[PDB]
Amino acid sequence: KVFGRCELAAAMKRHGLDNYRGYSLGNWVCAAKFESNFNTQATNRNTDGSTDYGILQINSRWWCNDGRTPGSRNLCNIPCSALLSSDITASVNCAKKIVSDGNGMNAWVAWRNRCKGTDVQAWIRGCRL
Ligand SMILES: [Cl-]
Ligand SMILES: [Cl-]
Ligand code: NA
């Protein structure tokens, strides 16, 4: 599924990300925009052989099982495929674990490089929330 901007902001709010670990809703929408262009089916192979999955590009190196990332962990206790669903539950629940683990949203490279320090409220501007 390719979410619209305000559509995703509303879904993310319903799924409990607004101000989760102190990160306002616009931080999460901005992260999704630059990680996946709001496409739940986005996958990208990293040069180490791990793959990033879903709207927040969660990496099989640590967070999910795809059966083809030797030596990796599955800290969210899910198949990576769960992260590709139209239903954002598994991505959201895993992201909540990630953002809680010490480094905050810096875990998302696109967030650090393209969202951090910017006017992230523009991403939810005008949305019915
Ligand atoms: Cl694996
Ligand atoms: Cl933080
Ligand atoms: Na893994």
UniProtKB/Swiss-Prot annotation:
GO biological process: cell wall macromolecule catabolic process; defense response to bacterium; defense response to Gram-negative bacterium; defense response to Gram-positive bacterium; killing of cells of another organism
Coiled-coil residue windows: none
Keyword set, alphabetical order: Allergen, Antimicrobial, Bacteriolytic enzyme, Disulfide bond, Glycosidase, Hydrolase, Secreted, Signal
Listed GO CC annotations: cytoplasm; endoplasmic reticulum; extracellular space
Catalytic activity of the protein: Hydrolysis of (1->4)-beta-linkages between N-acetylmuramic acid and N-acetyl-D-glucosamine residues in a peptidoglycan and between N-acetyl-D-glucosamine residues in chitodextrins
Domain C-type lysozyme, chain residue ranges per copy: 1-129
Binding site for substrate: D101
Location (main, coarse): secreted
Domain of life: Eukaryota
Gene3D superfamilies from the UniProt entry: 1.10.530.10
Tissue: In the egg white and polymorphonuclear leukocytes.
Residue pairs linked by disulfide bridges in the UniProt entry: C6-C127, C30-C115, C64-C80, C76-C94
EC number: 3.2.1.17
Pfam family, one: Lys
Location in the cell: Secreted
PANTHER family recorded: LYSOZYME C
Protein family: Belongs to the glycosyl hydrolase 22 family.
Other observations noted: Lysozyme C is capable of both hydrolysis and transglycosylation; it also shows a slight esterase activity. It acts rapidly on both peptide-substituted and unsubstituted peptidoglycan, and slowly on chitin oligosaccharides.
Purpose: Lysozymes have primarily a bacteriolytic function; those in tissues and body fluids are associated with the monocyte-macrophage system and enhance the activity of immunoagents. Has bacteriolytic activity against M.luteus.
Protein name per Swiss-Prot or TrEMBL: Lysozyme C
